[PDB]
Design an enzyme around this catalytic site. Structure first.
Site, PDB file in Angstrom:
ATOM      1  N   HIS A   1      16.340  35.604  23.091  1.00 43.80           N
ATOM      2  CA  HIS A   1      15.710  35.032  24.516  1.00 43.80           C
ATOM      3  C   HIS A   1      16.557  33.800  24.871  1.00 43.80           C
ATOM      4  O   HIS A   1      17.137  33.164  26.130  1.00 43.80           O
ATOM      5  CB  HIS A   1      14.713  34.350  24.876  1.00 43.80           C
ATOM      6  CG  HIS A   1      13.886  36.093  24.849  1.00 43.80           C
ATOM      7  ND1 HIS A   1      13.894  37.280  25.377  1.00 43.80           N
ATOM      8  CD2 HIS A   1      12.974  36.645  24.345  1.00 43.80           C
ATOM      9  CE1 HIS A   1      13.134  38.399  24.320  1.00 43.80           C
ATOM     10  NE2 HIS A   1      12.487  37.877  23.555  1.00 43.80           N
TER      11      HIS A   1
ATOM     12  N   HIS B   1      13.320  24.279  23.966  1.00 41.12           N
ATOM     13  CA  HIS B   1      13.967  25.212  24.150  1.00 41.12           C
ATOM     14  C   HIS B   1      15.017  25.147  25.377  1.00 41.12           C
ATOM     15  O   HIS B   1      14.237  23.574  26.579  1.00 41.12           O
ATOM     16  CB  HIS B   1      13.412  26.694  24.308  1.00 41.12           C
ATOM     17  CG  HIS B   1      12.737  27.027  25.380  1.00 41.12           C
ATOM     18  ND1 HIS B   1      11.071  26.317  25.489  1.00 41.12           N
ATOM     19  CD2 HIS B   1      13.215  27.073  26.975  1.00 41.12           C
ATOM     20  CE1 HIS B   1      10.764  27.008  26.453  1.00 41.12           C
ATOM     21  NE2 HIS B   1      11.471  27.317  27.281  1.00 41.12           N
TER      22      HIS B   1
ATOM     23  N   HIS C   1      17.323  26.770  28.903  1.00 41.02           N
ATOM     24  CA  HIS C   1      18.033  27.811  29.837  1.00 41.02           C
ATOM     25  C   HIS C   1      18.860  27.211  30.275  1.00 41.02           C
ATOM     26  O   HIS C   1      19.462  26.221  30.443  1.00 41.02           O
ATOM     27  CB  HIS C   1      16.740  28.416  30.635  1.00 41.02           C
ATOM     28  CG  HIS C   1      15.945  28.383  30.510  1.00 41.02           C
ATOM     29  ND1 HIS C   1      15.161  30.022  30.157  1.00 41.02           N
ATOM     30  CD2 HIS C   1      14.209  28.061  30.016  1.00 41.02           C
ATOM     31  CE1 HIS C   1      13.802  29.638  29.776  1.00 41.02           C
ATOM     32  NE2 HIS C   1      13.525  28.628  29.810  1.00 41.02           N
TER      33      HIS C   1
ATOM     34  N   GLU D   1      16.499  26.954  36.210  1.00 42.63           N
ATOM     35  CA  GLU D   1      15.276  27.812  36.336  1.00 42.63           C
ATOM     36  C   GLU D   1      14.865  26.592  37.473  1.00 42.63           C
ATOM     37  O   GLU D   1      14.470  27.924  38.363  1.00 42.63           O
ATOM     38  CB  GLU D   1      14.036  27.731  35.654  1.00 42.63           C
ATOM     39  CG  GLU D   1      15.211  28.474  34.422  1.00 42.63           C
ATOM     40  CD  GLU D   1      13.559  29.487  32.817  1.00 42.63           C
ATOM     41  OE1 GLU D   1      12.697  28.864  32.888  1.00 42.63           O
ATOM     42  OE2 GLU D   1      13.856  30.380  33.473  1.00 42.63           O
TER      43      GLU D   1
ATOM     44  N   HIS E   1      12.989  22.655  28.513  1.00 47.95           N
ATOM     45  CA  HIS E   1      11.425  22.806  28.802  1.00 47.95           C
ATOM     46  C   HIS E   1      10.888  22.065  27.462  1.00 47.95           C
ATOM     47  O   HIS E   1      11.173  23.031  26.437  1.00 47.95           O
ATOM     48  CB  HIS E   1      10.909  24.044  29.403  1.00 47.95           C
ATOM     49  CG  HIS E   1      11.394  24.624  30.199  1.00 47.95           C
ATOM     50  ND1 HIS E   1      11.271  26.491  30.835  1.00 47.95           N
ATOM     51  CD2 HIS E   1      11.842  24.492  31.027  1.00 47.95           C
ATOM     52  CE1 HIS E   1      11.949  25.708  32.180  1.00 47.95           C
ATOM     53  NE2 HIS E   1      12.514  24.886  32.169  1.00 47.95           N
TER      54      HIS E   1
ATOM     55  N   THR F   1       7.340  31.191  32.592  1.00 49.59           N
ATOM     56  CA  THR F   1       9.000  31.617  33.167  1.00 49.59           C
ATOM     57  C   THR F   1       9.583  32.963  32.151  1.00 49.59           C
ATOM     58  O   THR F   1      10.681  33.725  33.135  1.00 49.59           O
ATOM     59  CB  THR F   1      10.153  31.017  33.411  1.00 49.59           C
ATOM     60  OG1 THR F   1      10.269  30.118  32.228  1.00 49.59           O
ATOM     61  CG2 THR F   1       9.575  29.396  33.782  1.00 49.59           C
ATOM     62  N   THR F   2       8.833  33.215  31.397  1.00 49.95           N
ATOM     63  CA  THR F   2       9.376  34.445  30.708  1.00 49.95           C
ATOM     64  C   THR F   2       8.353  35.550  30.134  1.00 49.95           C
ATOM     65  O   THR F   2       7.272  34.678  30.642  1.00 49.95           O
ATOM     66  CB  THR F   2      10.091  34.150  29.057  1.00 49.95           C
ATOM     67  OG1 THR F   2       9.078  33.816  28.495  1.00 49.95           O
ATOM     68  CG2 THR F   2      10.959  33.522  28.969  1.00 49.95           C
TER      69      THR F   2
HETATM   70  C1  LIG Z   1       0.821  34.791  24.498  1.00 48.52           C
HETATM   71  C2  LIG Z   1       2.231  33.974  24.307  1.00 48.52           C
HETATM   72  C3  LIG Z   1       3.533  33.434  24.251  1.00 48.52           C
HETATM   73  C4  LIG Z   1       4.347  32.821  24.586  1.00 48.52           C
HETATM   74  N1  LIG Z   1       5.535  32.497  24.862  1.00 48.52           N
HETATM   75  C5  LIG Z   1       6.145  31.411  24.748  1.00 48.52           C
HETATM   76  C6  LIG Z   1       6.398  30.070  25.744  1.00 48.52           C
HETATM   77  C7  LIG Z   1       6.533  29.520  26.251  1.00 48.52           C
HETATM   78  C8  LIG Z   1       7.291  28.293  27.313  1.00 48.52           C
HETATM   79  C9  LIG Z   1       7.767  28.775  28.375  1.00 48.52           C
HETATM   80  S1  LIG Z   1       8.010  28.580  29.189  1.00 48.52           S
HETATM   81  N2  LIG Z   1       9.648  29.112  29.482  1.00 48.52           N
HETATM   82  O1  LIG Z   1       7.954  28.610  30.310  1.00 48.52           O
HETATM   83  O2  LIG Z   1       8.543  27.033  29.010  1.00 48.52           O
HETATM   84  C10 LIG Z   1       7.973  30.887  28.019  1.00 48.52           C
HETATM   85  C11 LIG Z   1       7.355  30.952  27.065  1.00 48.52           C
HETATM   86 ZN   LIG Z   2      11.550  27.664  29.061  1.00 49.55          ZN
END
Ligand SMILES: CCCCNCc1ccc(S(N)(=O)=O)cc1
Ligand SMILES: [Zn+2]
Ligand code: NA
EC number: 4.2.1.1
Length: 257
Positions: A61, A91, A93, A103, A116, A195-196
């Site tokens: 992703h 990471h 986007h 985003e 992020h 946001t995912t």
């Molecule tokens: C229950 C485990 C959820 C994993 N999900 C990680 C994760 C971290 C940060 C963001 S973001 N793009 O909001 O910073 C999305 C997803």
């Molecule tokens: Zn993110």
């Protein structure tokens, strides 16, 4: 099987993750004229001097640069936050074109990408517990615009060839995330979500006003990554952003006048 394509993208997520239509979803448009200065907001405290990066991972992703979060080594405090939040990963986007990719938007303007830096509240003991709490995470969001190169980003760009496809990882020790910050720590803040998927409503968003500049060559290399695994049909990792969601019953606060 969620993703960013026509058949599994943001418009579909609600079927498996009904919180997609919840009351504090992210990202949002930041309307700069409606955001209100909050004089009680404390300065951000970004303490990254002891940051210990470990690895970079293509997760299908985006790519994550992961940190040692088993001690208070790189922490975020202050601002709207109560307590101590540990850096676990960062990471990005980004878009297929320079005029899209972020985003969050600012007065409906889209940036080329968004960084992020993800932190979790240490009072909850581990990241998995933190994401189940309304104040579990603090994500520091930083806009990227295309212009001059960001020298502190180049080590990230350099290693992307080694993690082209989903599931690939590489050692990524001794990286200093301070090299990714703009000069000013002026920010907007609001309560939101991942946001995912799973889109959990556990995030205090802190979005910096000042973008960083990256070069066209740097963002071009982001766009050479793959969503797919090795040996699968190639799908370029681009446009891995969720669009702005309804603000609903929320106010965005500004740290600055
Ligand atoms: C229950 C485990 C959820 C994993 N999900 C990680 C994760 C971290 C940060 C963001 S973001 N793009 O909001 O910073 C999305 C997803
Ligand atoms: Zn993110
Ligand atoms: Na250029």
């Amino acid at each position: 099987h969620w993703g960013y394509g026509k058949h599994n993208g943001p418009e579909h997520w609600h079927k498996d993750f009904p919180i997609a239509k919840g009351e504090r979803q992210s990202p949002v448009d930041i309307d700069t004229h409606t955001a209100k200065y909050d004089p009680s907001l404390k300065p951000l405290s970004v303490s990254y001097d002891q940051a210990t990066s470990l690895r970079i991972l293509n997760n299908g992703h985006a790519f994550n640069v992961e940190f040692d979060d088993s001690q208070d080594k790189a922490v975020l405090k202050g601002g709207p936050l109560d307590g101590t939040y540990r850096l676990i990963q960062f990471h990005f986007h980004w878009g297929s074109l320079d005029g899209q990719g972020s985003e969050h938007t600012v007065d409906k303007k889209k940036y080329a990408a968004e960084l992020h830096l993800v932190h979790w509240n240490t009072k909850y003991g581990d990241f998995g517990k933190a994401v189940q709490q309304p104040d579990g995470l603090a994500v520091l969001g930083i806009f990227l615009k295309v212009g001059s190169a960001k020298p502190g980003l180049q080590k990230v760009v350099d290693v992307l060839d080694s993690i082209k496809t989903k599931g690939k990882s590489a050692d990524f020790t001794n990286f200093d995330p301070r090299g990714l910050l703009p000069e000013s720590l002026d920010y907007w803040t609001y309560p939101g979500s991942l946001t995912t998927p799973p889109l959990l409503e556990c995030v205090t968003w802190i979005v910096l006003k000042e973008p960083i500049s990256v070069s066209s060559e740097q963002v071009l290399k982001f766009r050479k990554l793959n969503f797919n695994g090795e040996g699968e049909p190639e799908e370029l990792m681009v446009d891995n952003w969720r669009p702005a969601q309804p603000l609903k019953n929320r106010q965005i606060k500004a740290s600055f006048k």
